[PDB]
Amino acid sequence: GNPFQANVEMKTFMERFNLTHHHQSGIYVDLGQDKEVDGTLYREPAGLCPIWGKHIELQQPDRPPYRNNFLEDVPTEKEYKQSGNPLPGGFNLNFVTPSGQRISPFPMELLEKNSNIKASTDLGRCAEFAFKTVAMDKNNKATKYRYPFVYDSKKRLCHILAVSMQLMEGKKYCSVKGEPPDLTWYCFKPRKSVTENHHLIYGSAYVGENPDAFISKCPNQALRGYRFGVWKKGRCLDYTELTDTVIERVESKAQCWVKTFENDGVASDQPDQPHSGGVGRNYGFYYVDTTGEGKCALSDQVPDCLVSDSAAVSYTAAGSLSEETPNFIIPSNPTPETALQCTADKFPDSFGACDVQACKRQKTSCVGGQIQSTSVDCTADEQNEC
Amino acid sequence: DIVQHMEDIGGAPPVSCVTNEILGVTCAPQAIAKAT
Numbered sequence: 001g002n003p004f005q006a007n008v009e010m011k012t013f014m015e016r017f018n019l020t021h022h023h024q025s026g027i028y029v030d031l032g033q034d035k036e037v038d039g040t041l042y043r044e045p046a047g048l049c050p051i052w053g054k055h056i057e058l059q060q061p062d063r064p065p066y067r068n069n070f071l072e073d074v075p076t077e078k079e080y081k082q083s084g085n086p087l088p089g090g091f092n093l094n095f096v097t098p099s100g101q102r103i104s105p106f107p108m109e110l111l112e113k114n115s116n117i118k119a120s121t122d123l124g125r126c127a128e129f130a131f132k133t134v135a136m137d138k139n140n141k142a143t144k145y146r147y148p149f150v151y152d153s154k155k156r157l158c159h160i161l162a163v164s165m166q167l168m169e170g171k172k173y174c175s176v177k178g179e180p181p182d183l184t185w186y187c188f189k190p191r192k193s194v195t196e197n198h199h200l201i202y203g204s205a206y207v208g209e210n211p212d213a214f215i216s217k218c219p220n221q222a223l224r225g226y227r228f229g230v231w232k233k234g235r236c237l238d239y240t241e242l243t244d245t246v247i248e249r250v251e252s253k254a255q256c257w258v259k260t261f262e263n264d265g266v267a268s269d270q271p272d273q274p275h276s277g278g279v280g281r282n283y284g285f286y287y288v289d290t291t292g293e294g295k296c297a298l299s300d301q302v303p304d305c306l307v308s309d310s311a312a313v314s315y316t317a318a319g320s321l322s323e324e325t326p327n328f329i330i331p332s333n334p335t336p337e338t339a340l341q342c343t344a345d346k347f348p349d350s351f352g353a354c355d356v357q358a359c360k361r362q363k364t365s366c367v368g369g370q371i372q373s374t375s376v377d378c379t380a381d382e383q384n385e386c
Numbered sequence: 387d388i389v390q391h392m393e394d395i396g397g398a399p400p401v402s403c404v405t406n407e408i409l410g411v412t413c414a415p416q417a418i419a420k421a422t
């Protein structure tokens with residue numbers, strides 16, 4: 001009797017943590033699909049979930065005209081001639097209509113009063129826009145290839161990126177800070193930062209295929225007060241209790257959230273052309289251990305239950321540091337806060353059988369109108385059995 | 387082959403226009419930077 005699997009409300013809530021089920025692509029590097037343009041197959045970002053805080057860190061030389069910023073226009077041929085190697089500018093698509101109107105960045109205000117845009121949230125509106133942008137081939141015919149997007153929720157600007165690459169390394173192909181000098185490309189990689197670019201949301205154009213779906217299907221926010229776990233031997237085991245978990249000492253919870261995205265086991269599609277389908281060390285939580293040390297628990301096991309812990313915060317590679325729903329994803333009319341509620345009156349303390357190997361048992365209850373789930377010592381005689 | 391390597395890490399189709407449902411056809415106002 002896994003309380004987190006006990007009814008329809010709970011199953012759906014929990015399923016929002018399953019990145020294999022709903023996101024289905026690489027996280028760190030999303031290259032999940034292949035698409036033909038002029039008889040060549042190209043890799044295309046494909047994930048269904050938006051990736052909160054992900055930005056692409058550039059390693060251009062620290063001098064004009066370089067700005068080290070992926071949201072700057074891709075470089076013009078002119079600009080490149082005026083700069084030398086490496087290529088300047090960034091990843092932003094710089095195309096215009098004949099009247100000169102930019103495709104990117106595009107103001108959210110123009111998207112919220114346009115009849116073609118059917119999304120309810122601002123983030124969706126931007127995803128949808130991305131979804132409705134396809135490349136044209138050498139015959140000017142629309143293809144099925146779509147560039148990823150970044151919503152800047154601070155500026156209410158939606159970006160389409162002309163560059164789908166997310167990771168370039170190796171001094172054979174790219175330079176760090178202009179070194180070596182003859183190289184075309186600067187190096188770059190995906191990052192999340194403990195302080196910067198939280199307001200940036202990166203996504204494949206396929207999050208806007210069903211633009212409202214990310215709201216109930218993706219783990220958009222950090223989850224305060226619980227630890228991710230898997231139901232096993234009749235109780236909820238949090239990642240601290242599993243063999244394959246990676247635990248690091250951290251200075252703050254933010255570092256842990258960064259780690260869920262940056263650890264070397266995270267779902268990645270980067271080479272050979274692998275497709276993670278979203279499997280990898282994508283889940284983790286910050287917690288304070290019994291001795292008062294702040295720690296991070298990193299795991300590749302999809303949560304199917306939660307252990308209660310008011311000092312803990314569970315994160316995923318997809319989601320934000322932020323623990324509360326922002327306005328740009330609330331409809332103009334999900335159940336993120338409400339699904340975990342109870343009343344003492346009806347939810348009585350139920351103690352599961354004794355896990356004899358650990359000599360603990362599940363206890364489930366209602367404390368402060370929310371479900372609490374922990375492991376307590378077995379009863380006295382029940383301990384005879386350990 | 388540099389093209390295979392690029393394709394592998396998500397190198398993009400070499401394209402000058404995109405169609406968007408809200409703005410129609412969208413093209414580069416100047417030549418896009420190419421190579422070395």
Ligand SMILES: *[C@@H]1O[C@H](CO)[C@@H](O)[C@H](O)[C@H]1NC(C)=O
Nearest residue numbers: 015018019020021302303304
């Ligand atoms: C996560 O997603 C996949 C596909 O839906 C499923 O096979 C897997 O068992 C799920 N894991 C859960 C719910 O723990």
